[PDB]
């Protein structure tokens with residue numbers, strides 16, 4: 001199948017952190033971060049897929065270090081895994097000084113056709129070491145995400161029964 | 165000291181406005197995550213009786229598309245209490261006001277950490293369920309928690325690698 | 329056909345963000361009114377089992393200042409059911425998560441009208457209280473309703489005069 | 493006491509109604525209207541008072557005619573009554589063609605000093621007929637607002653008892 | 657066919673809040689520009705008697721910092737009428753309610769084009785001044801118009817050239 | 821002291837949604853301008869190594885309508901370095917993910933000034949280009965700078981004159 005580099009659809013974001021972006025302890029609101037993460041990931045996935053996409057799941061968001069008033073942020077997003085119709089997008093959130101990693105997130109997107117049906121996406125390959133790390137560690141993440149979906153179906157059925 | 169899941173359980177009924185949705189009239193994943201985080205944090209704060217921070221979004225499963233004009237019900241509760249951490253589960257339902265029936269649109273799990281005035285992790289009360297759904301989430305929590313703990317290991321591996 | 333006040337009762341737990349407050353860190357009256365209207369409409373829709381429109385905001389009493397960082401609980405319910413109209417009462421409380429205690433920050437009464445698919449006023453179910461607070465608002469509704477009806481007269485006088 | 497004309501602090505607003513401002517039946521959201529109303533009223537009150545102000549209450553908002561996608565709106569706000577430290581602001585919302593009155597609102601504001609204590613405001617006088625209508629009909633509205641406050645205190649006490 | 661400059665004059669009043677400012681309490685240029693575009697568009701729309709689009713924004717100089725708590729009045733009117741295009745002049749004033757002071761902080765010029773339902777440029781009424789200030793803007797418009805028209809060519813050229 | 825133009829280059833990616841457009845699916849100029857100002861400021865801040873303020877925005881020509889669903893890439897870099905001031909050039913491109921097409925829709929120039937903690941203008945590093953496109957902007961900057969500097973005088977004059 002047609003292949004793309006991870007760099008090819010890679011997206012960047014630069015953002016300032018203002019007092020209105022943080023709580024009274026000067027820590028940036030998680031919701032704002034989450035909104036930015038999803039936004040940049042969706043564009044990256046659309047670029048890789050060459051089609052419209054939908055967020056299937058947020059696999060994880062880890063908040064490693066507090067982001068503070070006055071900090072400058074750089075977001076880096078890229079496709080780290082390509083299934084048949086699905087993509088894993090990895091998003092790094094760094095505090096710009098040289099850069100410190102403030103947060104790490106993985107999301108899964110599904111490409112859709114004009115009919116709204118899942119559509120095939122190109123494969124992806126890394127070119128430099130970091131890209132290779134994310135590419136190499138993805139299959140394990142994917143398998144875990146799949147196991148979690150399996151368990152989730154049990155909960156959904158229980159919750160559907162709870163309503164009747 | 166222990167609290168019931170009901171003591172800190174939180175609800176939110178919300179309309180989905182155009183500012184919340186994309187060009188396909190589907191609610192932003194980022195916005196949903198921000199709303200989820202917002203209500204979950206309040207639940208965690210109520211349970212801990214102290215300030216909290218979002219440690220992670222463990223997962224968000226986007227089950228059914230949420231559309232402009234939909235009515236949503238968010239339900240959040242503490243399903244697990246560690247030493248300093250809490251798992252909050254958030255159910256996001258699409259309310260059918262005409263038929264008094266609701267569809268589960270999304271399911272999310274998050275981890276919060278309670279802090280003292282000095283800003284260091286602080287002990288939280290234990291938690292216990294009382295009704296069936298509470299018991300379902302409470303009973304299935306240990307397996308999720310083990311996964312979260314497993315993820316932390318990998319995040320640390322990636323951080324360690326990225327420091328290059 | 330009659331419904332209990334509990335059947336359509338709605339809740340909202342919300343954090344107050346900087347985007348919601350002025351330079352004195354006080355929440356906008358307009359924003360509070362928008363949130364009030366939003367939750368009240370959902371309650372009215374649930375009760376009517378049909379689409380609704382806001383006929384009027386009968387009053388909003390701003391009792392205690394709401395500040396950036398506050399946690400709010402909104403509670404909305406139908407306190408009166410006319411032929412096509414409903415009175416919805418909304419309580420806005422400031423939650424003290426530390427002490428599990430809340431202060432009443434604002435009180436509001438609104439009138440909604442149910443509509444059919446053709447867009448004309450439509451009959452709504454009757455309403456009855458079950459617990460003490462519900463009974464309080466239900467019992468005091470007739471006096472408020474007479475005031476609202478009295479106001480309509482004056483609004484019509486003013487409209488009639490303004491047509492000049 | 494020092495006196496100001498109603499025209500002296502009068503404020504205007506012109507706004508377009510876009511599809512994103514209206515629901516699926518092309519009717520403008522009440523919350524947006526309410527937000528604009530409070531915003532313009534607060535500025536009018538500040539201008540009249542020559543000081544910071546707070547919204548004491550929203551005395552009423554009547555939605556007389558549906559506002560639709562593509563409509564052009566004009567807001568007119570002015571002080572129609574001046575107590576000792578308080579002001580009534582009347583806000584007219586018109587659909588611009590010659591103009592049709594879509595909504596009518598009355599709010600009460602309280603002027604505060606730098607210490608945050610209620611402060612005396614100038615008196616107000618009308619100059620043209622419409623201003624005179626609003627000025628002339630105010631005392632009755634004020635008295636009704638006062639009677640309503642009296643009743644509200646009973647509810648607040650009941651709700652405060654309900655919590656213990 | 658001719659209209660006065662005052663006939664289509666539009667207003668917007670808004671105060672500057674902390675969420676609108678940087679770390680030192682200075683208003684964002686983008687917020688100001690968004691507001692300018694909004695009010696100018698309404699004026700142009702009213703004068704044209706049809707939908708409009710922004711063809712261009714002339715430069716804007718920020719001479720003095722606009723600060724948290726400042727109250728701004730935006731005033732817009734048509735200063736020139738071409739065939740299908742209009743120059744809109746927007747005055748941005750700081751209202752100092754405390755001292756009854758009204759200072760002009762910034763001046764902005766924009767060009768709007770009237771369009772028909774087919775989306776094609778449409779003839780507009782002409783415009784005429786009535787007082788000295790209106791006449792000043794009216795008199796100085798032609799030079800600005802000829803310069804921006806030349807500038808459009810320069811812009812097209814630069815874009816075409818860079819696409820290489 | 822010198823920095824490359826690429827060294828402080830900043831990015832922002834955002835798609836155009838219905839809430840961002842007028843009745844005919846065309847993007848608001850104000851939204852574009854807000855985005856431009858945001859990304860330019862971050863670039864200037866990074867290059868300066870200090871806080872910055874927008875001194876001015878050169879004119880912007882809207883040559884082609886930006887439409888609902890378009891994906892925009894904002895790219896900002898410093899094209900000129902004065903003593904305390906910088907010219908920031910912002911390219912706005914429409915990414916067409918479907919066809920792997922990247923077209924330059926608009927170009928914008930802004931002037932930023934670096935300030936010290938006292939709020940006084942501060943010396944900035946110089947800037948140098950490395951590739952042809954950077955060099956083009958670098959080469960054409962002085963003319964733009966001298967013209968805007970003259971224009972500031974004109975702006976001050978006009979404001980001083982109108983205050984009469």
Ligand SMILES: CCCC(=O)SCCNC(=O)CCNC(=O)[C@@H](O)C(C)(C)COP(=O)(O)OP(=O)(O)OC[C@H]1O[C@@H](n2cnc3c(N)ncnc32)[C@H](O)[C@@H]1OP(=O)(O)O
Pocket residue numbers: 023027028029030031062063064065066067205216217218219220245246247248249250275277285312316
């Ligand atoms: C309400 C206002 C909005 C906000 O402030 S929240 C927006 C999120 N923004 C942030 O900046 C959060 C930054 N993250 C941090 O500060 C973290 O390091 C945090 C949560 C304080 C933990 O600090 P540490 O020094 O690592 O403490 P610790 O290692 O002993 O762990 C304490 C408990 O927290 C858990 N934890 C830490 N990191 C986690 C993670 N990524 N995901 C899930 N769980 C995590 C950890 O398992 C531990 O649990 P327990 O105490 O054994 O029950």
Ligand SMILES: CCCC(=O)SCCNC(=O)CCNC(=O)[C@@H](O)C(C)(C)COP(=O)(O)OP(=O)(O)OC[C@H]1O[C@@H](n2cnc3c(N)ncnc32)[C@H](O)[C@@H]1OP(=O)(O)O
Pocket residue numbers: 369380381382383384409410411412413414439441449476480515519520521522523554555556557558559
């Ligand atoms: C959820 C999406 C957001 C929205 O659409 S709501 C934002 C508000 N925007 C609007 O455009 C509402 C416009 N207002 C209207 O359309 C009204 O005329 C309305 C409510 C439909 C009533 O239409 P009418 O032709 O006058 O019908 P009607 O005179 O027979 O009265 C029907 C019931 O409604 C009541 N009512 C009408 N106007 C009212 C008012 N200002 N304040 C309080 N109550 C009012 C009226 O008392 C009557 O009650 P009942 O049926 O006897 O129980």
Ligand SMILES: CC(C)(COP(=O)(O)OP(=O)(O)OC[C@H]1O[C@@H](n2cnc3c(N)ncnc32)[C@H](O)[C@@H]1OP(=O)(O)O)[C@@H](O)C(=O)NCCC(=O)NCCS
Pocket residue numbers: 053054055056057083084085086087108110118145149190191192193225226227228229230
């Ligand atoms: C995913 C969705 C589009 C349809 O689900 P579906 O019918 O089960 O799709 P399919 O069964 O045909 O599976 C096809 C792909 O979807 C992936 N997928 C489906 N659900 C997933 C989930 N919870 N998590 C991760 N991947 C998922 C599958 O892995 C598969 O990818 P692959 O074949 O490349 O391996 C829908 O459930 C959904 O996501 N609604 C939410 C709307 C939304 O996301 N709004 C906010 C962001 S736009």
Ligand SMILES: CC(C)(COP(=O)(O)OP(=O)(O)OC[C@H]1O[C@@H](n2cnc3c(N)ncnc32)[C@H](O)[C@@H]1OP(=O)(O)O)[C@@H](O)C(=O)NCCC(=O)NCCS
Pocket residue numbers: 354355356357389390391392393394545546547548549575576577578579600602610637641
């Ligand atoms: C009103 C408030 C400032 C303090 O109330 P208070 O202590 O009772 O004030 P006072 O008893 O000293 O009364 C002084 C004035 O307030 C007026 N007032 C007080 N409560 C009022 C109410 N519910 N409705 C109308 N007027 C009221 C009184 O009429 C009086 O005016 P007057 O002397 O000119 O006739 C406070 O309760 C409040 O409004 N908090 C809400 C914050 C807010 O409004 N946020 C959104 C908008 S900024």
